[PDB]
Amino acid sequence: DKARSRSDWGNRNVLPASEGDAVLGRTAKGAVAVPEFGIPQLDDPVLGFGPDSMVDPRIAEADGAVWRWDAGFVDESMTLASCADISDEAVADEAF
Amino acid sequence: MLDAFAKVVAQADARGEFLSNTQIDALSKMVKEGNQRLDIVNKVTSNASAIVTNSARALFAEQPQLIQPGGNAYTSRRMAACLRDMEIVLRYVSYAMIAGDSSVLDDRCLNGLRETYQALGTPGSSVAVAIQKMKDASVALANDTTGTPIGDCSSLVAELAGYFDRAAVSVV
Amino acid sequence: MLDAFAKVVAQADARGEFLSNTQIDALSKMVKEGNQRLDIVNKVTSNASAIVTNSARALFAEQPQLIQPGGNAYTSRRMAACLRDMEIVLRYVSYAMIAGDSSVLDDRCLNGLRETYQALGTPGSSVAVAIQKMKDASVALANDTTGTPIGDCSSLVAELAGYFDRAAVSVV
Amino acid sequence: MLDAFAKVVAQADARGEFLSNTQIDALSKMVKEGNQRLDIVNKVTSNASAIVTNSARALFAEQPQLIQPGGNAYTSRRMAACLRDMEIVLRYVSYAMIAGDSSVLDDRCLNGLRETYQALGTPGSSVAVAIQKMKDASVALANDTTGTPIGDCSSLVAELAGYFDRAAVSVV
Amino acid sequence: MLDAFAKVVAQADARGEFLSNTQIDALSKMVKEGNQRLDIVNKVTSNASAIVTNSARALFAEQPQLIQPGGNAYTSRRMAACLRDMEIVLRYVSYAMIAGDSSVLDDRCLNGLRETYQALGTPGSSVAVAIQKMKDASVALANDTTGTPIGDCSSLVAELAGYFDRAAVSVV
Amino acid sequence: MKTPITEAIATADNQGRFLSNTELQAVNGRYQRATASLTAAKALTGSAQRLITGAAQAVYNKFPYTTQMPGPAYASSAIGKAKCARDIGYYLRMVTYCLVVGGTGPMDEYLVAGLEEINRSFDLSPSWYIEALQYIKNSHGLSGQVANEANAYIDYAINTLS
Amino acid sequence: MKTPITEAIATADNQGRFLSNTELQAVNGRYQRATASLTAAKALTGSAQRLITGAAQAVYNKFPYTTQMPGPAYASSAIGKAKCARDIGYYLRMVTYCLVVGGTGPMDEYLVAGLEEINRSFDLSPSWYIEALQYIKNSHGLSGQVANEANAYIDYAINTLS
Amino acid sequence: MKTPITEAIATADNQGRFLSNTELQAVNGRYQRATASLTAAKALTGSAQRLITGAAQAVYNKFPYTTQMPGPAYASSAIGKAKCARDIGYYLRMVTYCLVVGGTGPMDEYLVAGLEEINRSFDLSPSWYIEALQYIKNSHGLSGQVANEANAYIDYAINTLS
Amino acid sequence: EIVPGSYMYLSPAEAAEYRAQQAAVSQVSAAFSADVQSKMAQVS
Amino acid sequence: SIPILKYSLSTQNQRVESFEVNPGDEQYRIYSTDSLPSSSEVDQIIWAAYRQIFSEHQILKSTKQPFLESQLRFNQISIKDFIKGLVLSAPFRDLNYNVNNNYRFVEICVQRVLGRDIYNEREKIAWSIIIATQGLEGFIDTLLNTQEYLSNFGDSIVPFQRRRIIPQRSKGEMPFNLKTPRYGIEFRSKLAATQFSWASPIRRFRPQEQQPKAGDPALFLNMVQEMGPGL
Numbered sequence A: 001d002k003a004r005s006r007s008d009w010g011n012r013n014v015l016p017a018s019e020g021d022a023v024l025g026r027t028a029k030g031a032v033a034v035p036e037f038g039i040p041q042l043d044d045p046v047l048g049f050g051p052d053s054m055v056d057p058r059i060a061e062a063d064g065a066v067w068r069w070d071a072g073f074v075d076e077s078m079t080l081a082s083c084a085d086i087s088d089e090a091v092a093d094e095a096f
Numbered sequence B, C, D, E: 001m002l003d004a005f006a007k008v009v010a011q012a013d014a015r016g017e018f019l020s021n022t023q024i025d026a027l028s029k030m031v032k033e034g035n036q037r038l039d040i041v042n043k044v045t046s047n048a049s050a051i052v053t054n055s056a057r058a059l060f061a062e063q064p065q066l067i068q069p070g071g072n073a074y075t076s077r078r079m080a081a082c083l084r085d086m087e088i089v090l091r092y093v094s095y096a097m098i099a100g101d102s103s104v105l106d107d108r109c110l111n112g113l114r115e116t117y118q119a120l121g122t123p124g125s126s127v128a129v130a131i132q133k134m135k136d137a138s139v140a141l142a143n144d145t146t147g148t149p150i151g152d153c154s155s156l157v158a159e160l161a162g163y164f165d166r167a168a169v170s171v172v
Numbered sequence F, G, H: 001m002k003t004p005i006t007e008a009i010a011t012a013d014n015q016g017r018f019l020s021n022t023e024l025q026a027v028n029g030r031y032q033r034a035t036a037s038l039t040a041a042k043a044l045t046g047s048a049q050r051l052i053t054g055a056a057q058a059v060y061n062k063f064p065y066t067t068q069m070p071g072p073a074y075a076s077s078a079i080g081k082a083k084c085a086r087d088i089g090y091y092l093r094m095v096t097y098c099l100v101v102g103g104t105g106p107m108d109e110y111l112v113a114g115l116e117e118i119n120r121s122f123d124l125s126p127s128w129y130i131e132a133l134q135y136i137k138n139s140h141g142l143s144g145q146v147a148n149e150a151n152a153y154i155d156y157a158i159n160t161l162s
Numbered sequence I: 001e002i003v004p005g006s007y008m009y010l011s012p013a014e015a016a017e018y019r020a021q022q023a024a025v026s027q028v029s030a031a032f033s034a035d036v037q038s039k040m041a042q043v044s
Numbered sequence J: 001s002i003p004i005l006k007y008s009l010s011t012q013n014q015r016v017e018s019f020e021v022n023p024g025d026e027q028y029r030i031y032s033t034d035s036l037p038s039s040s041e042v043d044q045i046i047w048a049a050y051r052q053i054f055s056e057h058q059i060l061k062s063t064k065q066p067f068l069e070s071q072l073r074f075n076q077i078s079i080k081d082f083i084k085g086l087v088l089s090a091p092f093r094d095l096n097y098n099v100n101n102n103y104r105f106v107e108i109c110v111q112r113v114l115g116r117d118i119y120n121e122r123e124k125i126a127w128s129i130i131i132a133t134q135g136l137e138g139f140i141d142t143l144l145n146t147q148e149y150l151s152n153f154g155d156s157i158v159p160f161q162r163r164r165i166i167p168q169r170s171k172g173e174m175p176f177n178l179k180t181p182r183y184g185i186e187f188r189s190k191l192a193a194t195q196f197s198w199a200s201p202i203r204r205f206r207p208q209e210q211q212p213k214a215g216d217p218a219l220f221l222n223m224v225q226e227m228g229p230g231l
């Protein structure tokens, strides 16, 4: 059945799989939905969050996407980043 | 750990940004839910021993092998440690409910729990049934209107039951 | 840990042998250049803060994304841990220069450091750039004659440059 | 740890059973030969220093490459550690003789010992030779008729020989 | 440690009484003094580095024997401890301001401080001079009406000054 | 005791800290809720004798063997009936001590620490005291956030007995 | 993070306990203060570049040697003026993060931890940043309890540098 | 081991500190002494075969029961006589190891650690080895400060046996 | 008194030897005061 | 006299400084008798020491040491003697020492008494012979008298897992009770009343875990409980 009751949240249904299925008001985890982006301080190429300012390590644990049980955790052991570049000639000639 | 107001600050800093007026206006929508969030953890804390023992009684009525001689919840020291696990998980889902996100639940409770149960020989798929029976005992308690003013807290019920879902898929 | 002299004894005990005449005279060669080896480590530790704070300042001008928002040396604690690690590496290199071998540098500084940096997200190839900047800031200062009697100690400088190269390839 | 009596109890508790009458009668047969069991560990304990030092002396006569330079028993510290390893194993065999089963021998002494000797570089096959040299040295003492009434202990001596044999295959 | 609300409860349990309506209505007067009490504590904690540094600098101006060579504030390790000891006492006085009674000032700061200073040779009368110079530096700041609604809070500055006298007679 | 004021000092003394706005906001949350909990302690104090004699009678209707079974543990004599209404008054008094202080501090120190060795030795049943506390929860006559404050400390005592 | 929420979870988890009313009152005091504390962050963000270029000019007025003296540590070049106004905006952005969180959380992690080791190595005098924060403390223009929230985090930053 | 170089690194590393002049003065005292220690280690090595057999014959004169009494622990058989001179050569080799390193470093790990369990188990009296070491101290043939360095590690091995 | 926190406790004979050896360096700072007259074109 | 054998160090968090003046919420709550605690606060020192040495699952009534507690309340023993008295206690020998070998018991007592992980595998090998030749009473004395214990905890502080989280991060190292339980993959097999070692998830014909989709009327249920007032 659809999630109808607020009483069946504990009985039958678990939580929204994708964030387009969230409750009226909130994100997929259940917290309030806030827009991701604020005003950037210090617009500047050399000193400022440019396009290639490297990612915060604390952006994932703050997300909760580093823990394996939470849905944000993507495992990269089977994705294309873990496949060998065949254009590398050290890897082609060895594997020929 | 992070709460829900600290999760937006860590995303904003990672790109060296201020917070826009659209982001502040979404954080004062989280403040206005403040008294209904405190009623939900108060109803879970105040009934916390009936959540645990009514749902453990239900767990052994329909899986009676766990308390037979040779089972895992046999020999009352392992029965007492079994009820300890359910109070522990209920404690951290209660922590993640006032915080607004599950990061204190993720690394202080669930981190390494699936691999702990495999080293003990504890059926981790039956621990997930134990968490799922505390899930709707806690939801039926939070939908219950006794002691509360009229109004609305239905997006918060769906959020509390999502921390019980995260705790139950991390253990199987 | 071992020094250079205790390394030779450890080779000779495992064969159950007395030391030969040529192994004695090779050890009296290290005694002869002892004042030129003590003069190098004095030249390096006397400028130890300036080696670190200038090799860091050249690194963030060459790789400017390390101090941009999101970069690995962007906050005051991440900036101060970067200068901490360069000072630790330079400290154990100074230890390995009076001993004569890299036994204290491998055991007490480098053991598990590559796996520590992978788990943190710290770019290990950038740490190697900052160690090589400390290498030639120390080698250029060890070749400076202001205060020492004039002479050739270029074999000792090629030994000091190998401890820096050892830590540079053992971090990535 | 368990003795022979609590081994039967722990197996019976996992089935939820009382002990049968043939299990009590097999337990009271252990009590009937209990004095002869105590005379065996009286002979072994009273000569325990001579069991270790005579079988270690015979191990290096027939394996003279253990105490040559480079060998595993060559230094003062590596040789005295070979003597205390024999005294540990001989001690935990006598703990398995008065208990009746090899539960204190397996848990406290033999668990994880093959992998420890592989990490140390200790030749595990030669440790089995030293245990077998202690086996017949204490069997020859157990069959001594001095200070005892003459009877048949041959099933008990064949049990003591099985504890040394279990220790010798659990270490290679 | 106790606050003012648990001070009146520990005294009612020792006679087995409920609190009378006069003790309840004397406690709700302390609650409506609560916003004025948090203003005084905020006014001290935001000027805390200037309370310590000015009243230190005013102490070694009129007592130059403390910092003269041989004094008990010479040799900057002892100068760093005099500034720590001033900061500790001002910290635990502001702790006893939000509490309402000096039970946290008494045990975990002041119990054994005359005994400690007499063991080291610290002049305990000079410490009492420094404590009374942070008293009138923060009584003067709590009487400042900058950024507050102008009401009357003269009864809580006479309370805050009493905790400074409590710490000053306790070290002499 | 664990109060909201001594738990803000202890977390600031652990960090070697002056009282920041993290700690001033926490003490301010005590002062806001103290208006609703100081009237719950005033209304439970003034109607205490109605609540003690009622809650002891609610145990006697529910477990009537405690008035009939002979022995020193039971309320069958006149001595053992005054020791019951004594104990109901001890539990009601600690609840009022927690409402004026804020936080379950007085009953953590005076009541629950060592309680299980008392019930085990003198053969007292913790379900007698749950039934007494469930009467006081349903019969104190409070409403609003005044009943919300009182019932939150009744349920703490039940959760230590359950 | 030194939020009043995460400080409440930590005192409950220190003793392995559920969240009682001791900790829910600390959370409630954050929500009563979050109204004035969020209008301060909105008004400081909207006047960000006005306050940053103003506070940089106030340092060059009080310390005019910082624009003349040669060397990498000073604002005597075009790069040294870009890195100086970068640092004013760092101190301003951490203040606004503390206003949307409640309590001095982001300032301790991102700014204060390790600041003393940085200001010694790169020869950055902490008296420059005190003068820059005293400008923002006098020129943000807020009043009432909104300035009372704002100045409590300007003053907290000055006590770490002092 | 116990080289003076490793015993100067171990004090600087304990504090987590660089090498000051306190450590470089310590290593300089090793280098100003090693011209006598390395002439003593070469002079004992080149006269070893005279010193081993002379010290082994000296304990047969002092304790003649070793060459007569049966048992594996005595030098009455050709097996026991080859293991006796093997032991004298083990003591002289660790002496010349300690001279080229400086300080009693090599003979601690290789000869002293666990020595008391060997002499107790195999029933070797430590007064046999003291008589052998007192022969080498008498007739190593050295003089001056060369003989002072050799007798410093002879008497260390005597002090551990005695 | 050397500096206001660092002092020299010397006998009245040897306190003449301290003062008449730094007046023996006060006659060479009267001689490097002719290093200002040859500021330009020194060794030509 | 058989010294301990030499092992190599490894890079860890606690070997190096956190430049953290003003710690936050992950600071780990010093429990000390140097703050002169009352009777209600010395109960919290005792529960923190039980949680650190035992598990949370071994704070049963049959496990608590009532006479070791009363010698701490009278200032007869220090906290270093309370921690030693819990390791040599009869519940710790029965529930933990008897179901581990000598190498896994070293890493339990390093993690719980010293508050740090082992450096390498050879450190377990180096310390497991202190147990086998001197007993538990000799092993815990040479572990509490190291300079690692007397510098961090002294003799009046309860130990804790030193430096578990890095100050920026939200995901820190695993807690030492979840990382190392009572017994491991050996002693699991049949020595601890165990069968079959794994279990598939519970199947059911009423599915219980259906994910909501985009037109389901419970995602709009928000204000269904009550309409807002006004005009």
Ligand SMILES: C=CC1=C(C)[C@@H](Cc2[nH]c(/C=C3N=C(/C=C4\NC(=O)[C@H](C)[C@H]4CC)C(C)=C\3CCC(=O)O)c(CCC(=O)O)c2C)NC1=O
Pocket (backbone or CB within 6 Å): B034, B035, B036, B038, B039, B040, B042, B142, B143, B144, B145, B146, B148, B149, B150, B151, B152, B153, B154, F033, F145, F148, G021, G024, G025, G028
């Ligand atoms: C001391 C700790 C502490 C608490 C326990 C809460 C308790 C609490 N809740 C509410 C107030 C409320 N609480 C609820 C909650 C509910 N009503 C229902 O019908 C649902 C069953 C349930 C949500 C699941 C609602 C709907 C309101 C008021 C309406 C609103 O705020 O919009 C109020 C009054 C606020 C007001 O007057 O607006 C208080 C004090 N707050 C605290 O500070």
Ligand SMILES: C=CC1=C(C)[C@@H](Cc2[nH]c(/C=C3N=C(/C=C4\NC(=O)[C@H](C)[C@H]4CC)C(C)=C\3CCC(=O)O)c(CCC(=O)O)c2C)NC1=O
Pocket (backbone or CB within 6 Å): C032, C033, C034, C035, C036, C038, C039, C040, C042, C142, C143, C144, C145, C146, C148, C149, C150, C151, C152, C153, C154, C156, H024, H025, H028
């Ligand atoms: C107690 C602290 C202590 C020190 C700090 C050092 C410093 C030191 N160096 C030398 C002496 C010397 N030092 C050098 C070294 C150099 N000369 C150069 O031209 C190069 C720049 C550099 C080589 C890298 C040389 C070449 C000598 C003289 C010859 C030699 O020692 O071999 C001497 C005097 C010994 C002699 O005259 O030979 C001393 C004391 N030694 C110490 O005992």
Ligand SMILES: C=CC1=C(C)[C@@H](Cc2[nH]c(/C=C3N=C(/C=C4\NC(=O)[C@H](C)[C@H]4CC)C(C)=C\3CCC(=O)O)c(CCC(=O)O)c2C)NC1=O
Pocket (backbone or CB within 6 Å): D034, D035, D036, D038, D039, D040, D042, D142, D143, D144, D145, D146, D148, D149, D150, D151, D152, D153
């Ligand atoms: C607490 C100290 C303590 C001990 C050390 C043991 C030793 C011991 N065993 C026996 C008693 C005995 N001991 C033996 C043992 C042997 N007979 C043999 O021929 C073999 C050589 C050897 C077995 C290996 C036998 C067979 C008896 C039974 C007596 C008999 O058969 O006549 C007795 C006398 C009691 C009796 O007569 O039954 C004693 C003191 N028992 C103890 O209580």
Ligand SMILES: C=CC1=C(C)[C@@H](Cc2[nH]c(/C=C3N=C(/C=C4\NC(=O)[C@H](C)[C@H]4CC)C(C)=C\3CCC(=O)O)c(CCC(=O)O)c2C)NC1=O
Pocket (backbone or CB within 6 Å): E035, E036, E037, E038, E039, E040, E042, E142, E143, E144, E145, E146, E148, E149, E150, E151, E152, E153, E154, E156, E157, F024, F025, F028, G033, G145, G148
């Ligand atoms: C989050 C932290 C936090 C604070 C800092 C305070 C801030 C604060 N103070 C007052 C309100 C007040 N504050 C004070 C205190 C003072 N005024 C003076 O003139 C003296 C200088 C000083 C006392 C010595 C007084 C006296 C009032 C009431 C106005 C009056 O009657 O004079 C109020 C309005 C509520 C009321 O009227 O009680 C608030 C919010 N509250 C908080 O929650």
Ligand SMILES: CCC1=C(C)/C(=C/C2=NC(=C\c3[nH]c(/C=C4\NC(=O)[C@H](C)[C@H]4CC)c(C)c3CCC(=O)O)/C(CCC(=O)O)=C2C)NC1=O
Pocket (backbone or CB within 6 Å): B066, B072, B073, B078, B079, B081, B082, B083, B085, B086, B088, B089, B108, B109, B110, B113, B116, B120, B122, B123, B126, B127, B130, J055, J056, J057, J058, J177, J178, J181, J182
């Ligand atoms: C704070 C976060 C935290 C969690 C979550 C945690 C779990 C945890 N549960 C454990 C044991 C246990 N867990 C169970 C639980 C169960 N067995 C069953 O059959 C049921 C299906 C289930 C619950 C009803 C049992 C019986 C044991 C005892 C194992 C034993 O010692 O035999 C252990 C083993 C350590 C010990 O018992 O001393 C840990 C570490 N520990 C923590 O520190």
Ligand SMILES: CCC1=C(C)/C(=C/C2=NC(=C\c3[nH]c(/C=C4\NC(=O)[C@H](C)[C@H]4CC)c(C)c3CCC(=O)O)/C(CCC(=O)O)=C2C)NC1=O
Pocket (backbone or CB within 6 Å): A057, C066, C072, C073, C077, C078, C079, C081, C082, C083, C085, C086, C088, C089, C108, C109, C110, C111, C113, C116, C120, C121, C122, C123, C126, C127, C130, J010, J011, J012, J013, J014, J015, J016, J017, J018, J166, J168
């Ligand atoms: C055995 C001696 C020893 C060493 C050397 C050691 C290093 C070490 N460096 C660390 C972090 C770090 N290391 C760096 C270093 C760098 N990042 C960069 O971008 C630069 C390229 C580089 C140096 C300039 C930074 C920035 C951190 C911590 C912040 C983080 O990574 O989140 C950490 C994590 C814990 C902490 O941050 O305090 C350890 C344990 N630990 C040891 O015990």
Ligand SMILES: CCC1=C(C)/C(=C/C2=NC(=C\c3[nH]c(/C=C4\NC(=O)[C@H](C)[C@H]4CC)c(C)c3CCC(=O)O)/C(CCC(=O)O)=C2C)NC1=O
Pocket (backbone or CB within 6 Å): D066, D072, D073, D077, D078, D079, D081, D082, D083, D085, D086, D088, D089, D108, D109, D110, D111, D113, D116, D120, D122, D123, D126, D127, D130, J004, J005, J102, J125, J126, J128, J129, J132
């Ligand atoms: C579970 C009960 C238990 C046992 C049995 C045990 C043995 C044990 N034997 C060890 C070493 C050793 N054991 C030996 C013994 C031998 N090598 C040989 O060549 C001979 C064949 C044999 C003597 C018969 C040696 C040589 C060492 C290493 C000494 C060293 O590396 O310095 C060590 C390493 C500790 C050390 O370095 O001293 C352990 C832990 N540990 C335990 O906890």
Ligand SMILES: CCC1=C(C)/C(=C/C2=NC(=C\c3[nH]c(/C=C4\NC(=O)[C@H](C)[C@H]4CC)c(C)c3CCC(=O)O)/C(CCC(=O)O)=C2C)NC1=O
Pocket (backbone or CB within 6 Å): E066, E072, E073, E077, E078, E079, E081, E082, E083, E085, E086, E088, E108, E109, E110, E113, E116, E120, E122, E123, E126, E127, E130
């Ligand atoms: C419970 C909290 C707590 C308190 C109260 C405390 C007091 C305390 N102050 C001390 C020292 C000190 N206290 C002072 C202070 C002063 N001397 C003067 O002449 C001035 C009058 C005054 C500064 C205004 C000095 C100079 C020392 C160092 C004494 C020494 O080491 O010789 C010491 C000796 C340890 C050390 O040398 O640092 C303690 C234990 N310590 C604590 O942990």
Ligand SMILES: CCC1=C(C)/C(=C/C2=NC(=C\c3[nH]c(/C=C4\NC(=O)[C@H](C)[C@H]4CC)c(C)c3CCC(=O)O)/C(CCC(=O)O)=C2C)NC1=O
Pocket (backbone or CB within 6 Å): F056, F059, F066, F072, F073, F074, F075, F076, F080, F081, F083, F084, F085, F087, F088, F090, F110, F111, F118, F122, F124, F128, F132
């Ligand atoms: C302030 C904290 C505190 C508590 C909780 C407390 C309980 C307490 N209840 C007791 C006895 C008792 N309690 C009862 C009460 C009951 N039995 C019944 O049958 C009724 C159903 C029930 C009444 C509701 C009785 C009959 C005894 C006497 C037991 C005996 O004398 O053997 C005793 C034995 C000593 C005595 O009072 O005579 C203690 C210590 N004491 C305290 O100081």
Ligand SMILES: CCC1=C(C)/C(=C/C2=NC(=C\c3[nH]c(/C=C4\NC(=O)[C@H](C)[C@H]4CC)c(C)c3CCC(=O)O)/C(CCC(=O)O)=C2C)NC1=O
Pocket (backbone or CB within 6 Å): C057, C060, C067, C073, C074, C075, C076, C079, G056, G059, G066, G067, G072, G073, G074, G075, G076, G079, G080, G081, G083, G084, G085, G087, G088, G090, G091, G110, G111, G118, G122, G124, G128, G132
């Ligand atoms: C988010 C927390 C945070 C802070 C506070 C921070 C400060 C900071 N300021 C720095 C440099 C600097 N800061 C200045 C700023 C100034 N000098 C002047 O003369 C002016 C008076 C003043 C401007 C007010 C200058 C000129 C440098 C370059 C110094 C050098 O590179 O040696 C550096 C060295 C690296 C760099 O940015 O180039 C750090 C780490 N970094 C951080 O991540």
Ligand SMILES: CCC1=C(C)/C(=C/C2=NC(=C\c3[nH]c(/C=C4\NC(=O)[C@H](C)[C@H]4CC)c(C)c3CCC(=O)O)/C(CCC(=O)O)=C2C)NC1=O
Pocket (backbone or CB within 6 Å): D057, D060, D067, D074, D075, D076, D079, H056, H059, H066, H072, H073, H074, H075, H079, H080, H081, H083, H084, H085, H087, H088, H090, H110, H111, H118, H122, H124, H128
């Ligand atoms: C490098 C450090 C080192 C030392 C010091 C050392 C001593 C040593 N001497 C031994 C035996 C022995 N040592 C002797 C020597 C003597 N007995 C006498 O009566 C003579 C007076 C005296 C000769 C001077 C004899 C006869 C044995 C054989 C004892 C036996 O096998 O039972 C043994 C038993 C194994 C063997 O070598 O056969 C050791 C381990 N081993 C070492 O690795």
